[PDB]
């Protein structure tokens, strides 16, 4: 690529094995960082799913207890009607009714919690299922990220895109899977640090975005 | 993001049953409020969408033209390696456009077109002010291409590609059309042009239009072009005519390019470059005080006098220092510091000899903020030793011999002050006009070497100033305050001999060139003693000639200068009209090669 650019007419600049050493160091660092981030994210997801399963089990237990003591209240009311000692039975039925009201209120709050958290669960399950596939593409995607972050810092946008497309064609021909449907800036820069860069007088273009990524990494 | 992070870290640290804690109810309320703010997100997104679609449908073609203009200016440096414009220069162009509106409309639909036209015009002006005249047609063609691409208008991509890559593509071998009125190279050009479906039956059409043997080939094909490209837009008709004249008569390709640019952008689009350079307004307004004013100059034509006259007119002080020795660098730095402190102008002459010092100068200039009314002028020759940093920092002005007899007269009359030309007697103005005509002819003849002159003499402004001085002093000698002189009493022989032996004949080597100069002086400085109907030249051998204006005043002579037709032939100069043909064809081929360099960037 450097020879092609030199023959095209732009100034060539020398490539050294220091570039390769830096690129392989970047590959190791990015692979380790992405693996650690995925592992801690999965741990958080597993804890959240276990807790919401426990909440669903508690909801079912509350429902069973509520219906059982509702039937108990009905039986006690029938017994008090037959006995129509009446004041004690009336006070007992009132206490059972207050317990039913409290448990029904807690069931209502638990139902609201389940309805609010169902939308979260419906995407947490998808992310958990997608994690198994996205674990495999880490090697190729971090390879591309390291090559971009250690090599293409001098060329312009078109030549950087040519390099990225060539590497992607090679990895496709080598039967190694890489995460195609993601931006190379989005994979490397977090949203909060992108916001901090945009606050720190950085232009909002992709070129300056990966330039800031190179300056950070 | 705070929503998601806080919710996950709250659910992960419950350490118990969620249904048995009120903190989980607080997180529920948090989720409800944040769902409410996610709900009101939608109207803000809708207003953002309507705003961005409004601004897109208003000013997207303007931004596309912005990008195309700046990238053409960036890729411009591949031609002459001298000009390197910068994004700061382009943004200064935008501050000039969007904030200086002539006749300032209030209707946005007309204001957008006004902004676009003013952008194209001021971009061409500010860029071609620092380019040789060989490349102005190339830049105008690029501007016209950008206008055509940004125009609803059918894009002429295939025929423009054929026009740019006509000679490069291989034509038919062994195929020779009729030689009835065209040569072998013309036949090859027709064969190459025959690939276009529109230009299909050209072999039939050239013999169909047998009576049009003058409009197609020979004569002057600028105004007249036979045949056409279904209805066709005028721009497409211009493109077809340009292709036809490239096939038939490659000499007038420059004229066809000029009229194509005129039809595509305006008949006065590039006509402001023929005017003399108005340095005063550009220096006082269009130049930031930090930015130095580079005055590049071709050899034999300096530019110190222009800025010295400017400083004299504007009563400012210039500490002109010649560059080329160490103490020279010392007073240059001292005067620059004193100028930044005070505000007076500073000149450094011939800076093209110390690039190592120019690097320090450019870095020092970027390291300081100057006074408001302080401009730094640097003058240099065109050589590769000039640092690209300095070229990027400074505004670039080129100084070249003016293209055209009319342009030369305009520059001469702008240079000569009105108080000097309008002095008594009344024949001084006519004598100055004759002097300017003679200077224009002898300087226009330098272009067509070695026919006009055997050698490239340095017939510059020094000779003109000395001739004006000697005319003034001999007229003061022969006129004792009289308001008018009879033409017989004018020292014609004295003026002829003095300008033939001291001023203009001083640089003349060959006896044949000296005889030629004597011929011009004898023909021109007699006028049959200021007789009317004095034939200056013969523009066309068939019923055309240039005659002396009957005016007797500077305003009349200037008016006669601007009434000259924009067309010019070497028959004005006295050369045969075939003198400029090979040079014009070579310039056309150079234009084609320059645009080929432009488009490609868009054993032994």
Curated annotation (Swiss-Prot), chain A:
Top-level division of the source organism's lineage: Eukaryota
Bridged cysteine pairs (disulfide): none
Localization terms from the record: Cytoplasm, Cytoskeleton
Residues found modified as N6-acetyllysine: 115
Linked pathology: Charcot-Marie-Tooth disease, axonal, type 2O: An axonal form of Charcot-Marie-Tooth disease, a disorder of the peripheral nervous system, characterized by progressive weakness and atrophy, initially of the peroneal muscles and later of the distal muscles of the arms. Charcot-Marie-Tooth disease is classified in two main groups on the basis of electrophysiologic properties and histopathology: primary peripheral demyelinating neuropathies (designated CMT1 when they are dominantly inherited) and primary peripheral axonal neuropathies (CMT2).
General function of this protein: Cytoplasmic dynein 1 acts as a motor for the intracellular retrograde motility of vesicles and organelles along microtubules. Dynein has ATPase activity; the force-producing power stroke is thought to occur on release of ADP. Plays a role in mitotic spindle assembly and metaphase plate congression.
Record text on subunit structure and interactions: Homodimer. The cytoplasmic dynein 1 complex consists of two catalytic heavy chains (HCs) and a number of non-catalytic subunits presented by intermediate chains (ICs), light intermediate chains (LICs) and light chains (LCs); the composition seems to vary in respect to the IC, LIC and LC composition. The heavy chain homodimer serves as a scaffold for the probable homodimeric assembly of the respective non-catalytic subunits. The ICs and LICs bind directly to the HC dimer and dynein LCs assemble on the IC dimer. Interacts with DYNC1LI1; DYNC1LI1 and DYNC1LI2 bind mutually exclusive to DYNC1H1.
Note on domains (UniProt): Dynein heavy chains probably consist of an N-terminal stem (which binds cargo and interacts with other dynein components), and the head or motor domain. The motor contains six tandemly-linked AAA domains in the head, which form a ring. A stalk-like structure (formed by two of the coiled coil domains) protrudes between AAA 4 and AAA 5 and terminates in a microtubule-binding site. A seventh domain may also contribute to this ring; it is not clear whether the N-terminus or the C-terminus forms this extra domain.
Protein name, per record: Cytoplasmic dynein 1 heavy chain 1
Taxonomy of the source species: Eukaryota, Metazoa, Chordata, Craniata, Vertebrata
Gene: DYNC1H1
């Amino acid at each position: 690529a450097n020879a092609r650019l030199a023959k095209r007419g732009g100034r060539t600049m020398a490539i050294t094995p220091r570039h390769y050493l830096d690129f392989i160091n970047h590959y190791a660092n990015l692979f380790h960082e992405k693996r650690s981030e995925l592992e801690e994210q999965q741990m958080h997801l597993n804890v959240g799913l276990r807790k919401i399963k426990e909440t669903v089990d508690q909801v079912e237990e509350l429902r069973r207890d509520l219906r059982i003591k509702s039937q108990e209240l009905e039986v006690k009311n029938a017994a008090a009607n037959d006995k129509l000692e009446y004041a004690v039975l009336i006070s007992e039925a009132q206490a059972i009714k207050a317990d039913l009201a409290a448990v029904e209120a807690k069931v209502n709050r638990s139902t609201a919690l389940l309805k609010s958290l169902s939308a979260e669960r419906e995407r947490w399950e998808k992310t958990s299922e997608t994690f198994k596939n996205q674990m495999s593409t880490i090697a190729g995607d971090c390879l591309l990220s390291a090559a971009f972050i250690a090599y293409a810092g001098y060329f312009d946008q078109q030549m950087r895109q040519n390099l990225f497309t060539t590497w992607s064609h090679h990895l496709q021909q080598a039967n190694i899977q890489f995460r195609t449907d993601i931006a190379r800036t989005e994979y490397l820069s977090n949203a909060d640090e992108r916001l901090r860069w945009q606050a720190s007088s950085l232009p909002a273009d992709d070129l300056c975005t990966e330039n800031a990524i190179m300056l950070k990494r | 993001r705070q929503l998601e992070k806080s919710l996950l870290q709250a659910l992960n640290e419950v350490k118990g049953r969620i249904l048995d804690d009120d903190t989980i109810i607080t997180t529920l309320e948090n989720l409800k409020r944040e769902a409410a703010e996610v709900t009101r997100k939608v109207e803000e997104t809708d207003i953002v969408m309507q705003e961005v679609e409004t601004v897109s449908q208003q000013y997207l073609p303007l931004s596309t033209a912005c990008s195309s203009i700046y990238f053409t200016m960036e890729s411009l440096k591949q031609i002459h390696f001298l000009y390197q414009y910068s994004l700061q220069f382009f943004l200064d162009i935008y501050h000039n456009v969007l904030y200086e509106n002539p006749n300032l409309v209030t209707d946005h639909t007309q204001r957008l077109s006004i902004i676009t036209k003013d952008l194209f015009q001021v971009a061409f002006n500010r860029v071609a002010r620092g380019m040789l005249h060989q490349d102005h047609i190339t830049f105008a063609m690029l501007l016209a291409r950008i206008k055509l691409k940004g125009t609803g208008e059918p894009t002429y991509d295939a025929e423009f590609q054929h026009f740019l890559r006509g000679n490069e593509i291989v034509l038919s071998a062994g195929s020779t059309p009729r030689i009835q009125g065209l040569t072998v190279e013309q036949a090859e050009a027709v064969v190459r042009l025959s690939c276009l479906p529109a230009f299909k039956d050209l072999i039939a059409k050239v013999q169909a239009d047998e009576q049009f043997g003058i409009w197609l080939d020979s004569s002057s094909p600028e105004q007249t072009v036979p045949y056409l490209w279904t209805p066709a837009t005028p721009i497409g008709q211009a493109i077809h005519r340009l292709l036809l004249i490239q096939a038939f008569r490659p000499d007038r390709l420059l004229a066809m390019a000029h009229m194509f640019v005129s039809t595509n952008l305006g008949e006065s689009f590039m006509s402001i470059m023929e005017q003399p350079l108005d340095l005063t307004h550009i220096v006082g307004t269009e130049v930031k005080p930090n930015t130095p004013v580079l005055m590049c100059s071709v050899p034999g034509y300096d530019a110190s006098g222009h800025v010295e006259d400017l400083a004299a007119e504007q009563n400012t002080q210039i500490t002109s220092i010649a560059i080329g020795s160490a103490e020279g660098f010392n007073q240059a730095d001292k005067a620059i510091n004193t100028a930044v402190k005070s505000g007076r102008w500073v000149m450094l002459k011939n800076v093209h000899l110390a690039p190592g010092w120019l690097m320090q100068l450019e870095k020092k200039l970027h390291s300081l903020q100057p006074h408001a009314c302080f401009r730094l002028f640097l003058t240099m020759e065109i050589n590769p030793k000039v640092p690209v940093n300095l070229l990027r920092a400074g505004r670039i002005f080129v100084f070249e011999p003016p293209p055209g007899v009319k342009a030369n007269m305009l520059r001469t009359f702008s240079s000569i002050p009105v108080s000097r030309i309008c002095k008594s007697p009344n024949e001084r103005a006519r004598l100055y006009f004759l002097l300017a005509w003679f200077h224009a002819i002898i300087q226009e003849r330098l272009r067509y070497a070695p026919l006009g002159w055997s050698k490239k003499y340095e017939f510059g402004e020094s000779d003109l100033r000395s001739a004006c001085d000697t005319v003034d002093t001999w007229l003061d000698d022969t006129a004792k305050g009289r308001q008018n002189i009879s033409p017989d009493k004018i020292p014609w022989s004295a003026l002829k001999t003095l300008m033939a032996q001291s001023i203009y004949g001083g640089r003349v080597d060959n006896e044949f060139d000296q005889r030629l100069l004597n011929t011009f002086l004898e023909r021109l400085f007699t006028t049959r003693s200021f007789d009317s109907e004095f034939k200056l030249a013969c523009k066309v051998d068939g019923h055309k000639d240039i005659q002396m204006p009957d005016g007797i005043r500077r305003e009349e002579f200037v008016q006669w200068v601007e009434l000259l037709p924009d067309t010019q032939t070497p028959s004005w100069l006295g050369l045969p009209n075939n003198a400029e043909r090979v040079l014009l064809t070579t310039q056309g081929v150079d234009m084609i090669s320059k645009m080929l360099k432009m488009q490609m960037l868009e054993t032994l």
